[PDB]
Design a protein around this ligand. Structure first.
Ligand SMILES: OC[C@H]1O[C@@H](O[C@H]2[C@H](O)[C@@H](O)[C@@H](O)O[C@@H]2CO)[C@H](O)[C@@H](O)[C@@H]1O
Ligand SMILES: OC[C@H]1O[C@@H](O[C@H]2[C@H](O)[C@@H](O)[C@H](O)O[C@@H]2CO)[C@H](O)[C@@H](O)[C@@H]1O
Length: 255
């Protein structure tokens, strides 16, 4: 069992897949109270009951992103050993991700259940900047909209509780220090099981960025990681009570 009760990263293995879990309070300057993240071989859980919160940088809006991930997270210059990522986007034929989740939170708290990747020009960057892309996939949100503005909608299939459905995904785009693309499901799901192919979101992102002056050759970027977690907070959030459980994780990367 892996148990963390303060910010940090631990590597673990879940049904043979090497992963990293990060009790990530990246934009919190100070807090009081409790946080706990645990992996027991079958499930990863997170719980927070924190108060006296203030952000390091209110311009970043959210306060943290407790998560787990497969691959190399640029910002932490970290990857567990044994991951098949990073690989160039062009080499990915398909990348299936499956997980079951159950999110709970006080009603007022800005929060999402979001997955993400970082597409970078070089294989092991320690930051993203102009020319790089962040792609997020939001399956749930509460009192939180993605950054930038909504530009498009895409119909992309996924399997929900074992049934193939067609989701309608809003695409939000922001041009910051790097390009931010967030796909947000229009019928959010707070608890369930999802399976989907990341290649559909890479394809949509490539089309959306086809006329970009900032992103040069999208298919030559490196797909570095797949992160799964919950962003939370806004610049006004002073306390946060929420938690989640993830189970039934599997992936199939075909390169
Ligand atoms: O900016 C560096 C931190 O990024 C964190 O990821 C953020 C990202 O910057 C946002 O634009 C959006 O994609 O949500 C992410 C999660 O909140 C990263 O988790 C931190 O480790 C970095 O310090
Ligand atoms: O860290 C950036 C953060 O942005 C979040 O969206 C904010 C956005 O930054 C702000 O300019 C706008 O006014 O409000 C939204 C929130 O509604 C975005 O939700 C996160 O994914 C992203 O991490």
């Amino acid at each position: 069992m892996v148990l963390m009760t303060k910010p940090g990263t631990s590597d673990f293995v879940w049904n043979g897949i090497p992963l990293s879990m990060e009790l990530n309070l990246w934009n919190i300057k100070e807090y009081s109270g409790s946080v706990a993240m645990k992996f027991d071989g079958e499930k990863i859980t997170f719980d927070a009951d924190i108060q006296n919160l203030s952000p390091k940088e209110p311009e970043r809006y959210v306060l943290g992103y407790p998560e787990f991930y497969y691959g190399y997270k640029p910002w932490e210059n970290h990857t567990a050993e044994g991951s098949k990522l990073p690989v160039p986007v062009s080499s990915m034929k398909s990348f299936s991700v499956e997980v079951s989740f159950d999110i709970h939170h006080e009603p007022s708290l800005p929060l999402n259940f979001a997955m993400e990747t970082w597409l970078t020009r070089e294989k092991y960057q320690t930051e993203a900047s102009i020319g790089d892309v962040c792609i997020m996939v939001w399956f749930y949100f509460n009192n939180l909209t993605p950054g930038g503005e909504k530009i498009e909608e895409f119909t992309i299939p996924f399997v929900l509780n074992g049934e193939s459905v067609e989701g309608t995904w809003e695409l939000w785009l922001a041009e910051w220090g790097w390009d931010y693309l967030a796909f947000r499901l229009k019928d959010p799901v707070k608890k369930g099981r999802v399976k989907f192919d990341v290649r559909h979101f890479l394809d949509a992102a490539g089309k959306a960025l086809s006329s970009s002056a900032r992103v040069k050759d999208f298919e030559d970027l490196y797909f570095t990681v797949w992160e799964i977690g919950t962003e939370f907070g806004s610049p006004e959030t002073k306390s946060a009570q929420f938690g989640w459980k993830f189970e039934n994780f599997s992936i199939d990367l075909e390169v």
